[PDB]
Write a structure and sequence with these properties.
- Belongs to the BET family.
- It is found in: Nucleus; Chromosome.
- The protein is mainly α.
- The protein has seven helices and no strands.
- The structure holds ligand JGF.
- The ligand CCS(=O)(=O)Nc1ccc(Oc2ccc(F)cc2F)c(-c2cn(C)c(=O)c3cc(-c4cnc(C5CCC5)[nH]4)oc23)c1 binds next to helix 3, helix 6 and helix 7.
Length: about 110
């Protein structure tokens, strides 16, 4: 259960993404997209591999990530699903972008 130095960094990023500091734009990402509740027609046809922060959290807490690139691929998938489904002017796309800017900058500062 001991994380590598790179995955400890990633755990730090995840905790920041889930923190009150980012909650104004992170909240739509805290749990899987409920397509039924939202009426997102054909969400699960268009999005083959759903992802959200609760999923990333589970993988990290269970020590299931093999490396940092796996973590980054999941977080990027979460954002790319959002951009792929939604129109460019939707509020959730703006929120995704704000959260992704936090992620990309912090991830880039991972010790190599
Ligand atoms: C906490 C997870 S949840 O149980 O599914 N709750 C939830 C609540 C609000 C969500 O997004 C919104 C953001 C802003 C807004 F004004 C409305 C939202 F539905 C979203 C939401 C998250 N993600 C990742 C998305 O990609 C989308 C897309 C949409 C969405 C809602 N209405 C549309 C339009 C029809 C296509 C554009 N898209 O809502 C979410 C989810």
């Amino acid at each position: 259960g001991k994380l590598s130095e790179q995955l400890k960094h990633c755990n730090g990023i995840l905790k920041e993404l889930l923190s009150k500091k980012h909650a104004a734009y992170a909240w739509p990402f805290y749990k899987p997209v409920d397509a039924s509740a939202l009426g997102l027609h054909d969400y699960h046809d268009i999005i083959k591999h759903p992802m959200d922060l609760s999923t990333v959290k589970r993988k990290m807490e269970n020590r299931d990530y093999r490396d940092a690139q796996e973590f980054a691929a999941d977080v990027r998938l979460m954002f790319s699903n959002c951009y792929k489904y939604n129109p460019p002017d939707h509020d959730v796309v703006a929120m995704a972008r704000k959260l992704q800017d936090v992620f990309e900058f912090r991830y880039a500062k991972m010790p190599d």
